[PDB]
Amino acid sequence: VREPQIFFNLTYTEYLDKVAASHGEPFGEESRNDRVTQDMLQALHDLCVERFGTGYRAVSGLCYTDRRATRKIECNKPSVRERDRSVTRACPKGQECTTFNAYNFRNRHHQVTFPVCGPRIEVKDRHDIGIHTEWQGTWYPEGTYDYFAQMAGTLNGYFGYDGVYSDGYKTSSHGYGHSWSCINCPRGKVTITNTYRATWAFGYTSPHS
Numbered sequence: 001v002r003e004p005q006i007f008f009n010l011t012y013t014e015y016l017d018k019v020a021a022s023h024g025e026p027f028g029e030e031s032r033n034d035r036v037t038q039d040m041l042q043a044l045h046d047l048c049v050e051r052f053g054t055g056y057r058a059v060s061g062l063c064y065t066d067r068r069a070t071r072k073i074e075c076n077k078p079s080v081r082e083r084d085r086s087v088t089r090a091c092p093k094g095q096e097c098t099t100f101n102a103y104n105f106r107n108r109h110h111q112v113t114f115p116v117c118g119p120r121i122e123v124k125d126r127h128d129i130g131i132h133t134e135w136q137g138t139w140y141p142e143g144t145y146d147y148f149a150q151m152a153g154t155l156n157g158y159f160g161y162d163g164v165y166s167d168g169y170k171t172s173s174h175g176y177g178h179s180w181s182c183i184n185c186p187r188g189k190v191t192i193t194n195t196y197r198a199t200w201a202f203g204y205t206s207p208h209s
Contacts (some may be wrong), residue, residue, distance in 0.1 A: 002144075002165070002184075003022070003184055004144070004163075004171050004182065004183070004184050004185045004186070005018065005022065005181075005182070005183040005184060005185075006161075006173045006180070006181070006182055006183075006185070007180070007181040007183075008159070008175050008176075008177040008179065008180055008181075009177045009178050009179055010148075010179055010181050011179070012098055012099075012100065012148060012150065012179075012204070013100055013101055014181075015146075015148045015179075015181040015183075015204075016034075016036055016037060016100060018181060018183050019034075019036045019146045019183055019206075019208075020034035020035070020036050020037075022183045022184055022208075023035070023209065025042065026038055026105075027057065027078065027105045028078065028104075028105030028106060029103045029104065029105055029106065029107060029108045030102075030103055030104065030105050031103075032103045032108075033102050033103050035209065036146075036206070036209075037100060037101070037102040038102070040100060040102070040114070040116060041058060041102050041104075041114060044058035044061065044073055044114055044115075045057045045058050047071075047073055047075075047087060047089055048073060048075035048087060051075070051087040052075050052077065052085055052087070053077075055077040055078070055079065056075045056076065056077045056085075057075065057076060057077065057078070057104070057105055058073050058074065058075055058104070058114060059074050059075065059076050059084060059104040059105070059106065059107075059112065060073075060074045060084075060104065060112045060113060060114065061073035061074060061113070061114045061115045062099070062113065062115055063097035063098065063099060063115045064097075065097075068090045068091065068093070069090065069091040069095060069096045069097040069117065070088060070089070070090045070091065070097065071088070071089050071090075071091065071097055071115040071116075071117065072086055072087075072088050072115070073086065073087050073088075073089070073114075073115070074086055075087060076106075078105060078106070091117035092117060094119060094120055095117040095118055095119055095120060096117065096118065096119075096120045096200075096202050097115050097116070097117055098115070098116060098118065098202060098204075099113045099114060099115050099116070100113070100114055100116055101113055101114070102114055116204075118148075118202055118203055118204035118205075119139065119202075119203045119204075120200050120201075120202065120203075121137045121138075121139045121149065121190075121192060121200060121201040121202070121203050122137050122198075122200055123135050123136065123137035123157070123192050123193070123194060123198060123199045123200055123201055124137065124198040124199075125137065125138075126198075127193070132195070133195065134193045134194060134195045135193065135194055135195075135197065135198045135199065136191060136192065136193045137191070137192045137193075137200075137201060138189065138190065138191050138192075139189070139190040139191075139192070139201075139203050140189055140190075141187075141188070141190065141203065141205035142205050143207065143208065144184045144185055144186055144187075144207075144208040145182070145184075145185055145186075145187065145205055145206065145207055145208055146181075146182070146183050146184070146185070146205070146206050146207075146208050147161075147180075147181065147182040147185060147188075147190065147203075147204070147205050148179065148180075148181050148182075148202075148203065148204040148205075149179060149180050149190055149192065149201055149202065149203045149204075150178060150179035150180075150201060150202050151178050151179070151192075151194070151199065151201050152199060152200050152201060152202065153199070155178075155194055155196050155197075155199055156176060156177055156178050156194070157176070157177075157192055157193050157194030157195075157196075157201075158174060158175065158176050158192070158193045158194070159173070159174070159175060159176075159177070159179075159180035159190065159191075159192055160172075160173070160174045160190065160191035160192070160193070161173045161174070161180065161182060161185075161188055161189070161190050161191075162188050162189050163182070163185050163186035163187060163188030163189075164186055164187065164188060165186045166186075170186075171185060171186055171188075183208070184208045185208075190203065
C-alpha cells in the first residue's frame with residue numbers, strides 16, 4: 001500500500017510520533033516504547049555493551065560539541081547496584097547530534113532523553129537571480145523511507161523533495177518552514193534553500209518498516 005505522508009514544521013520527536021502512528025528485545029519499562037524508538041535505543045545499548053560488556057543498557061544520554069558533535073551515554077546493567085557509567089562517542093564526521101525520548105528499563109514514570117546522530121547538510125551554494133540571493137544545499141538520503149530535515153537555529157527556508165518509486169511514479173513537495181518530514185516515501189533527493197545566509201541543516205533517514 002502506497003501512502004506517503006508529508007509534514008512541515010514538526011520537531012524531530014513529532015516526526016518519530018508520525019512514524020509510529022503510520023503503523024498503528026525490550027527489557028523492563030522499555031516494553032513501553034514504540035518499535036521506532038526502541039530500535040534507536042537498542043543501537044545505544046550496543047554502545048554500552050561494547051564499552052561495559054554484556055547486559056549493560058543505555059539509561060540516558062546527551063549531545064555536546066568538543067571540536068566534533070559528540071554523544072555522552074549513561075549505561076547500567078540491571079543486575080548491578082552501581083552508579084551509572086558513561087561512555088562518549090563522537091558522531092561520525094559530517095554528522096550532528098540531536099535527541100529523542102524513550103523509556104529506559106527502570107523508570108516507568110516518564111521517558112528520558114537519548115542522543116542520535118544524523119547528517120549535516122551544508123546550505124552554502126549561492127544562487128543569484130536579479131538582486132535576490134539564496135543559498136542551497138542538497139541531500140541524497142541513504143522500499144520506502146521515513147525522512148526528516150530541519151534548519152538550524154531560528155532560520156527557515158524552502159525544503160524541496162523529489163522522490164521516485166521503483167516503477168517510475170513520482171512524489172514531490174516544495175514548501176517553506178523550519179522542517180520537513182516524509183513518512184513512507186520513495187527514495188529521493190532533498191534540496192534546502194534559504195535567503196538569509198549560508199547555513200546548515202540536519203537530516204535523518206530510516207527505512208520505513
